[PDB]
């Protein structure tokens, strides 16, 4: 019950559809209401997500 | 790989140490609009 | 451990980089850009950004604090000038078509003669024509004739469908016209072939809304760069639509296009080749009689002939055979060709 309550007290997330992106730990994410964004990868996942 | 506007350091190497810091906090950001009309003796 | 100054600038900028739009460039280390929502900002530009490829119409990288130009971005895989170039060869050269030899010397003197033998023009000081219009009934020989002439050439060739020039980013339309004509100028004197130009040019209407002006400016800039009159280098342009009366008149008037080739009707002469051409790449059995199919039906095109041969191939595969008998052709002649037979004054005119 405390585990679900701490994660509840948290600002949420977004979603971006990526078909392809560049290397060097930076990807091209485009959100729905706005345009494209060159953002950073996270270290808990792989770079190879194209 | 990518480019992201790079160059070999011989022309921007001296530019990239303290001139970037003076173009952030002193240098502001403005926007463009259009002007519909005006008034007399007062803006 | 040696690469340090590049690593710092990889770390100097902000991490959530957004993607911007170049609008105008002032050479005082600041300019005006555009965000994705059409919001525009009086921001600045850095020094490492390699100011050589900054063109109004290019994409850049912006920040969230001051939104200055972080670095120039490439075209991001936008192959809108390289795909339309025909690399390989088209279809058969001149023996594919039949019964259009009235119209062959027109295009041969207009395209091949200015390139292969540019001496007839210099014996009398007469300029070659620039544009050629190919109109007529729809699907007559227009696409088949353009591939016939483009096969017999000794220069590069362009294939433009016309719908791959129209986008909605308010600059992409007339830019790709300049980007193509720069490619055609810098490279060999290619053959511009923009098919279906009636979608972009007709009757020149100007509205107040922002759905139509993106066509008219792209059309107007096309007529500007066609008649730029600076250095064109003998670029031959072939334009073709079906109808001609609902088109742009100032493209018709001389100084622009002086060749208006019409592609009239048929006959029972040109058909028999197209029957043989379409019945060549199949398991044509030795029990089929195409001459009865030719004489009987008296109004059909090659697209009708193609629809016969495909339905003949389908009927042979429904009865689980390899070869095709004459009966599959007979039924295909009676099935497919009954979709348009309407309207004739028979027995009235001898």
UniProtKB/Swiss-Prot annotation, chain A:
It is found in: Cytoplasm; Nucleus. Component of the 26S proteasome, a multiprotein complex involved in the ATP-dependent degradation of ubiquitinated proteins. This complex plays a key role in the maintenance of protein homeostasis by removing misfolded or damaged proteins, which could impair cellular functions, and by removing proteins whose functions are no longer required. Therefore, the proteasome participates in numerous cellular processes, including cell cycle progression, apoptosis, or DNA damage repair. Component of the 19S proteasome regulatory particle complex. The 26S proteasome consists of a 20S core particle (CP) and two 19S regulatory subunits (RP). The regulatory particle is made of a lid composed of 9 subunits, a base containing 6 ATPases including PSMC5 and few additional components. Component of a complex with USP49 and RUVBL1. Interacts with PRPF19. Interacts with TRIM5. Interacts with NDC80. Interacts with PAAF1. Interacts, in vitro, with the thyroid hormone receptor (in a thyroid hormone T3-dependent manner) and with retinoid X receptor (RXR). Interacts with ERCC6. Belongs to the AAA ATPase family. This is 26S proteasome regulatory subunit 8.
UniProtKB/Swiss-Prot annotation, chain B:
This is 26S proteasome regulatory subunit 7. Belongs to the AAA ATPase family. Induction: Expression is not cell cycle-dependent and occurs throughout the cell cycle. The chain holds residues 67 to 109 of 433 of the full protein. It comes from Homo sapiens (Human). Component of the 26S proteasome, a multiprotein complex involved in the ATP-dependent degradation of ubiquitinated proteins. This complex plays a key role in the maintenance of protein homeostasis by removing misfolded or damaged proteins, which could impair cellular functions, and by removing proteins whose functions are no longer required. Therefore, the proteasome participates in numerous cellular processes, including cell cycle progression, apoptosis, or DNA damage repair. Monoubiquitinated by RNF181. Phosphorylated. Dephosphorylated by UBLCP1 which impairs PSMC2 ATPase activity and disrupts 26S proteasome assembly. Component of the 19S proteasome regulatory particle complex. The 26S proteasome consists of a 20S core particle (CP) and two 19S regulatory subunits (RP). The regulatory particle is made of a lid composed of 9 subunits, a base containing 6 ATPases including PSMC2 and few additional components. Interacts with NDC80/HEC; this interaction is detected only during M phase. Interacts and SQSTM1. Interacts with PAAF1. Directly interacts with TRIM5. Signal peptide: none annotated. It is found in: Cytoplasm.
Swiss-Prot record, chain C:
It comes from the Eukaryota. The modification Phosphothreonine is found at residue 344. ATP binds at residues 136-143. Changing residue 238 to T: In BKAH; uncertain significance; contrary to the wild type, it fails to rescue eye defects in Rpt2-null Drosophila. There is a cross-link at residue 147 (Glycyl lysine isopeptide (Lys-Gly) (interchain with G-Cter in ubiquitin)). Residues 1-13 have a biased composition (Basic and acidic residues). GO terms for molecular function: ATP binding; ATP hydrolysis activity; proteasome-activating activity; RNA binding. The modification Phosphotyrosine is found at residue 349. The modification N6-acetyllysine is found at residue 168. GO terms for cellular component: cytosol; membrane; nucleoplasm; nucleus; proteasome accessory complex; proteasome complex; proteasome regulatory particle, base subcomplex. Keywords: Acetylation, ATP-binding, Cytoplasm, Deafness, Intellectual disability, Isopeptide bond, Lipoprotein, Membrane, Myristate, Nucleotide-binding, Nucleus, Phosphoprotein, Proteasome, Ubl conjugation. One of its GO terms (biological process) is proteasome-mediated ubiquitin-dependent protein catabolic process. Residues 1-14 are annotated as: Disordered. Transmembrane segments: none annotated. It is a lipid-anchor. It is found in: Cytoplasm; Nucleus; Membrane. It is linked to Birk-Aharoni syndrome: An autosomal recessive disorder characterized by failure to thrive, severe developmental delay, intellectual disability, spastic tetraplegia with central hypotonia, chorea, hearing loss, micropenis and undescended testes, as well as mild elevation of liver enzymes. Belongs to the AAA ATPase family. Component of the 26S proteasome, a multiprotein complex involved in the ATP-dependent degradation of ubiquitinated proteins. This complex plays a key role in the maintenance of protein homeostasis by removing misfolded or damaged proteins, which could impair cellular functions, and by removing proteins whose functions are no longer required. Therefore, the proteasome participates in numerous cellular processes, including cell cycle progression, apoptosis, or DNA damage repair. This is 26S proteasome regulatory subunit 4. It comes from Homo sapiens. The gene is PSMC1.
């Amino acid at each position: 019950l405390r585990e679900e309550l701490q994660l509840l007290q948290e600002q949420g997330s977004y979603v971006g559809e990526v078909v392809r992106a560049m290397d060097k730990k930076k990807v091209l994410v485009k959100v729905h209401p706005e345009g494209k964004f060159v953002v950073d990868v996270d270290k808990n996942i792989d770079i190879n997500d194209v | 790989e990518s480019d992201t506007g790079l160059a070999p350091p011989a022309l921007w190497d001296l530019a990239a140490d303290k001139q970037t810091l003076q173009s952030e906090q002193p240098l502001q950001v403005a926007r463009c609009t259009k002007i519909i009309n005006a008034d007399s003796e007062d803006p | 451990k040696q690469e340090e100054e590049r690593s710092k600038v990889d770390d100097l900028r902000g991490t959530p980089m957004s993607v911007g739009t170049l609008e105008e460039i002032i050479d005082d280390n600041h300019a005006i850009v555009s965000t994705s929502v059409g919001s525009e900002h009086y921001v600045s530009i850095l020094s490492f950004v390699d100011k050589d490829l900054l063109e109004p119409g290019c994409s850049v990288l912006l920040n969230h604090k001051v939104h200055a130009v972080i670095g120039v971005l490439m075209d991001d895989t936008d192959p809108l000038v390289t795909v339309m170039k025909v690399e390989k060869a088209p279809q058969e050269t001149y023996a594919d078509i039949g019964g259009l030899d009235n119209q062959i010397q027109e295009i041969k003197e207009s395209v091949e003669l200015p390139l292969t033998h540019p001496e007839y023009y210099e014996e009398m000081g007469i300029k070659p024509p620039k544009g050629v219009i190919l109109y007529g009934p729809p699907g007559t020989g227009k696409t088949l004739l353009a591939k016939a002439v483009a096969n017999q050439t000794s220069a590069t060739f362009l294939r433009v469908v016309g719908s791959e020039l129209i986008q909605k980013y308010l600059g992409d339309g007339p830019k790709l016209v300049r980007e193509l004509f720069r490619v055609a100028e810098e490279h060999a004197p290619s053959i511009v072939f923009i098919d279906e130009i009636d979608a972009i040019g007709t009757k020149r209407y100007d509205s107040n809304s922002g759905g139509e002006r993106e066509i008219q400016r792209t059309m107007l800039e096309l007529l500007n760069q066609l008649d730029g009159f600076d250095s064109r280098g003998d670029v031959k342009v072939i334009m073709a639509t079906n109808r001609i009366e609902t088109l742009d008149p100032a493209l018709i008037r001389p100084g622009r296009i002086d060749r208006k080739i019409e592609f009239p009707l048929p006959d029972e002469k040109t058909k028999k080749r197209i029957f043989q051409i379409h019945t060549s790449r199949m398991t044509l059995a030795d029990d089929v009689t195409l001459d009865d199919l030719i004489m009987a039906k008296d109004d059909l095109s090659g697209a009708d002939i193609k629809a016969i041969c495909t339905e003949a191939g389908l009927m042979a595969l429904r009865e689980r055979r390899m070869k095709v008998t004459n009966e599959d052709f007979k039924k295909s002649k009676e099935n497919v060709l009954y979709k348009k037979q309407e309207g004739t004054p028979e027995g009235l005119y001898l």
